[PDB]
Amino acid sequence: ANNWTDILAASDGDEWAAFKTIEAQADEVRAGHQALRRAKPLIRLWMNNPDGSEGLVYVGRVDYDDTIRGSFPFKNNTPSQGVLELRDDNYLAVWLK
Amino acid sequence: PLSTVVSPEDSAVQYKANFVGQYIGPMWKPMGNGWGSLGIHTHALISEAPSM
Amino acid sequence: PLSTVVSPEDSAVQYKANFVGQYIGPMWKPMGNGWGSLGIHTHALISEAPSM
Amino acid sequence: SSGGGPAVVNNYGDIHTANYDEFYKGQQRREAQQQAPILPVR
Amino acid sequence: SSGGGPAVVNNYGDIHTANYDEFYKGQQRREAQQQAPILPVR
Amino acid sequence: SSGGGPAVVNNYGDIHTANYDEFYKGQQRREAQQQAPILPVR
Amino acid sequence: VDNSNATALEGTFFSGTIVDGFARSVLLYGGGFVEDTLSVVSDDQTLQPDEYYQSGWLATMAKMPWLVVRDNEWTPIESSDLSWGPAKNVSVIVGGDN
Amino acid sequence: TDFLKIELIGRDGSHWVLSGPGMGQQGVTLNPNLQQFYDAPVKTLYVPGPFGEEYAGKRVQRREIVFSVQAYDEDPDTWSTVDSLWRWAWDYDEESELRVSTSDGTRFLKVRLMEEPKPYYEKDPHITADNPIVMTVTATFPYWQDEPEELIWTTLSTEDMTRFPVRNDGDVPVWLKWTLTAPGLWILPDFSWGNDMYSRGREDLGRTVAMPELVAGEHVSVDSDPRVQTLIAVNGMPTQNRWKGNDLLYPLMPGKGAEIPVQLKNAPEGGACKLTRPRWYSRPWSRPGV
Amino acid sequence: TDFLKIELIGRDGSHWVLSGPGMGQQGVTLNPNLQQFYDAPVKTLYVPGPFGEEYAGKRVQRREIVFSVQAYDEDPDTWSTVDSLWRWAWDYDEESELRVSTSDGTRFLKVRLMEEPKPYYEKDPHITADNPIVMTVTATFPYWQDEPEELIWTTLSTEDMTRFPVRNDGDVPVWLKWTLTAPGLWILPDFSWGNDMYSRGREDLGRTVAMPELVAGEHVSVDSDPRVQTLIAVNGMPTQNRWKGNDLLYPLMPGKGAEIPVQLKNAPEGGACKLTRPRWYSRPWSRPGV
Amino acid sequence: TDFLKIELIGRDGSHWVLSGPGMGQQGVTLNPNLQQFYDAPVKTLYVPGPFGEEYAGKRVQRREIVFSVQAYDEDPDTWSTVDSLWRWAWDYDEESELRVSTSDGTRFLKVRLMEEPKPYYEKDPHITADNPIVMTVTATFPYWQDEPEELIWTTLSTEDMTRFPVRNDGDVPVWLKWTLTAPGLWILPDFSWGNDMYSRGREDLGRTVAMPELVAGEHVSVDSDPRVQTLIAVNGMPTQNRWKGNDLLYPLMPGKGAEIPVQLKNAPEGGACKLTRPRWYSRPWSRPGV
Amino acid sequence: HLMALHDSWIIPGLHIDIGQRMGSTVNSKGVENIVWVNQLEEMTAAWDNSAGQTMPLSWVLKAGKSDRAMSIGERVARLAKKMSEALNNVGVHIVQS
């Protein structure tokens, strides 16, 4: 809770400096939001345990750049189909084949 | 167009040096005695880190 | 080029297998009985390494 | 240079090279994604 | 003048600028007009 | 001569003269051939 | 006609490799005969059909499938769609009124 | 000529004078025939109508500027250094500034590499040490702009009011930004300026909107431009979530200005307000419009 | 020139010297600018990847050779005879040979009329008796061929083995052909030569495959090239039908060669084997590859 | 010129100097007007926005270099030898190296034949014995490379730690490769270097990832690049299977570097770690930037 | 209402989730002021890395639902599912003879 008086004192009584401080804070919050929005997805394939026990076992990860195309819908109370296209030289594509 | 030009809000800064390399390096500016007045001493007799 | 480079066919090869991890590996192709006919036995009753 | 040639043909969009079979298959795939999970198993 | 250029391209028909998206949407709209009233409300 | 003109446009395929109506009708006819004999008579 | 020959006593080919040819399997029925698995014939000694020793014969006999269509860089065919999907439901309920 | 000066300030802070007084001192000059450089591209929309087509609106398009520079030096090694520096001045991810200075002032356009540059002649460039680089840059924000007008009003009273003089001297509408301290409840103007985009031209002549009551330490930035979220607090609190669907809807229309009122209430300390009015223009130079 | 000779042998067996020593003796010479004649057309495949497009493979394409010839004679009647003979030397259904002879030897390409020839000038051809014919021919098999290298091994023993020296001196893989007498169980080599097309280059280094036991009179031809069914019996019996879904998988890759082993068993009469190694090249002339 | 030297190392290891000091000694020189040779082709993505279109990212494209060479000799026989050797220096399946040497060092590009070469003039090439070949090569990896830097750290202790000095002097991010011996538990750095591609640029500044415990004989290659699987065991064991939804996500951003820590624990016989760092550039030559 | 969030500050899943009410406007004369408030029903994340057409990861929202504006194929599929379920129910409610 940095009050206006506290910010002005930190800026040594310069209103323009204090407002530039506040603007920099707002800009960093906006930049964090933009990075969160533009973050790449994490696509991971898991399998059942070969011995027949519980717990999914990590197969691997598909890179977003290594995908060809993808489409994942979230629907309200309705099943949806996700589609992922890979090159056949991809290691997870080879594993699936 | 600017109402006022204010000094940028420079934040806290940090620096470190250990003198493990060969020469002094450009991060240290010699003064008084001019360029090439600084050096690194190994101090291997006591088995200690090199000093400037 | 033949003098400079060494061909894969003109190369002596040596292969190892220990079965200490209790896994056959992909280098042993089953013959006659097909897949699943090979196994690793621990032999823990004696103080001996696993065998194939 | 760009304005008035292939660089504006790209702005025109699918006037030159563009195939019908691939577009139809893509539309069919999108419809299949939309409708497949809700079709019955019978 | 007209014979042998864009004015005969118009006679050719949809060889130059013509997109697939609105054509497919129009076909879907026509089929929806045909079939929507007879589809049950259930 | 052939390489770099209409003779390679033919290799490009359906970039120049090709209309969407016949392609859509042909796809509809293929689907009708596939699905008509199995549709019920009711 | 029975062209697959899957339910026959000698079985048929359910899998194979391009380096070893086809693999002969026979159906083995579990308890209640609802479920059938595949057991491989390790020592396959099925005789060739008599039709395979006749001039001018081209057909595929059910007991001895032979035709493998190979796709590679110099394939004579055009493969379009090879799709595999796993089984879905472990159990089935059938009934109503008895 | 001395009536126009063009500079590039690269992503790395380098300064190049491509045209005007002192051009080519850094080794790179500007070749003729630069396109989509003066007027902001706009496409107009039309609906079918009884007399042909009816006007439906306008949309401003991004700038696709294709221009050539000429990098020169007496010796090929120094030419190579100059060419490398020019290449380092540009990027795809981050934008570099392109400043045009005339008797109307200095206006800058932020441009980034749209695609890879096309350098050199058909032979190797060390033969000549004087080679052209064709650059296809793009301006996502297509308006030339100047430094915005900033005003500050601080107070110690619990309840107070102020008037900010505002005036759009450019040819395109601009979107105002506010910086508001906390705690306090602010009433901010959203005057329509007679604009009829929502069919509320003179209905919203004196529209004022109430920001949500800011808690201690929740200094907010209120940006009316559509590129960015309106309310952002510096402490990360979701201020807009408490702002029940309200928004700033109107930009400052060209040729319009007034003393817009700002009200502060429920501020025990007494807060501060800052208003930022952008100076957007559709042309590198233009006489002021009244 | 004397460094290069070009010949045509028509569907009717006629011999034409289009270029080289003795060109034009039959009245027809070759005009410049012949295309898709030297290198076999190959298209490369690419799949999207993180750094652009990744290599996905290569496919050879058929040749579309468009070339012009000039048919000439002093008198129009003899010119008409020459033109008729040249037209008779071509067909759509059956191919005619096109031989290129250089210091590297003689290599032939089988071409057929892709479409109708385009003869003569704008005026009637009897004015000049010296007219060009534009021929658009096609090569379904795009590689240039030399006469294949053939080896024969005969044995009177019931069980025997031999080794055939084989080496691909060309720049393209070639597919071996075998001719095996009957009765007898043959085992033929299908060495990978380090070809990783099936991801088994090192596993199939010494791969051998057994043909089905051949009955009396059932001499077989085993052609590994994909245009042809692998096993074909002389007496029409379905040998590949008996052969349980096996196949010859690998061609002899360029630069590879060895003494491939052939095994014969259960042959009371003692049998014979013939190996045919084709000599395919991608250019009409090329120095030998090692 | 002596400021630029272009060489080719063929698929067969032949060495050609196309331009610079010693060009044409092997008979082949480089003709002018070569395209997509200097700058890496990058396409920038744009998505609709309030003021036109907003920047959405960049995608680097594979290089499609179309150039021409001239094979020359005094006599047609030796010209034919030179042309055959030049053709043998290329392939479709396997790549050949194209090096550029300048005062900034030597950088190479791996290129392959995209399509069949277009050789010779309209007439037979033995006349002139000096003929051009039009080459359309492609670089699947579009970045010019220098030899990657390799660092080795061997330890005999059960538990040990080292600091690998790493630095990206290029203009593009690079992906590190690790070669770890077994047995032992390895902890490798995955520093973000400020990269915010996963919205964790500051959270992952000092990020370290622990590989699964390696059994005896399970030496691993840990390649961070998206083209290759991260974990590969030399014995074929599924090492990635025991690694619980974890990965190396971050390349080495340009202009960044430090002493990245590598830790080894539970190693009865010590262990060895090799770090390979590629040196990737978008241009054949460029002054160092920082 | 169908929306496509190209570079909007809205973060699907974070700012708004499936089933959660949101308002939307359309720049059409007569309904500029009106806000249509619907609970979010669909949101699809799609991308394409192909060289020909390259679409970065983008979100498309569908707020509210309508059987009328549903496509004919989707309507037929939903009707078929309901008909199959009802047929199973009737068949299992059949009284034997």
Topology:
The structure is cut from a larger assembly and holds three copies of chain A, two copies of chain B (52 residues), three copies of chain D (42 residues) and three copies of chain H (290 residues).
Chain A (H helix, E strand, L loop, with lengths): L3 H7 L4 H24 L4 E5 L9 E6 L4 E9 L7 E4 L4 H6 L1
Antiparallel strand pairs in A: 1-2, 3-4
Helix pairs in contact in A: 1-2
Chain B lengths: L52
Chain H lengths: L4 E5 L5 E5 L8 E3 L11 E8 L2 E9 L2 E10 L3 H13 L7 E7 L2 E9 L4 E2 L10 E10 L4 E11 L5 E8 L9 E4 L4 E5 L18 E3 L9 E4 L7 E3 L23 E9 L6 E10 L9
Antiparallel strand pairs in H: 1-2, 1-7, 3-6, 4-5, 6-10, 7-8, 8-10, 9-10, 11-19, 12-18, 13-16, 13-19, 14-15, 14-18, 16-17
General description of the model:
This is part of a larger assembly, with three copies of chain A, two copies of chain B (52 residues), three copies of chain D (42 residues) and three copies of chain H (290 residues). Chain A is an alpha+beta fold and 97 residues long. Chain A has helices spanning 4-10, 15-38, 91-96, and strands spanning 43-47, 57-62, 67-75, 83-86. In chain A, strand 3 and strand 4 form a beta hairpin. Chain A is elongated. Chain B is mostly loops. Chain B has no helix or strand. The termini of chain B are far apart. Chain H is mainly beta and 290 residues long. Chain H has one helix at 76-88, and strands at 5-9, 15-19, 28-30, 42-49, 52-60, 63-72, 96-102, 105-113, 118-119, 130-139, 144-154, 160-167, 177-180, 185-189, 208-210, 220-223, 231-233, 257-265, 272-281. Chain I binds chain J through residues 1, 3-4, 19, 32-34, 38-44, 46, 49-55, 58, 102-104, 171, 283, 285-287, 289, and chain J through 59-62, 76-77, 80-81, 84-85, 87-88, 92-93, 112-124, 126-127, 138, 140-143, 225-227. The PDB classes it as viral protein. The entry lists the keywords Mycobacteriophage, phage structure, Icosahedral, cryo-EM, protein assembly, virus, viral protein. The entry is titled "Cryo-EM structure of Mycobacteriophage Douge baseplate (gp13, gp17, gp23, gp16, gp18 and gp20)".
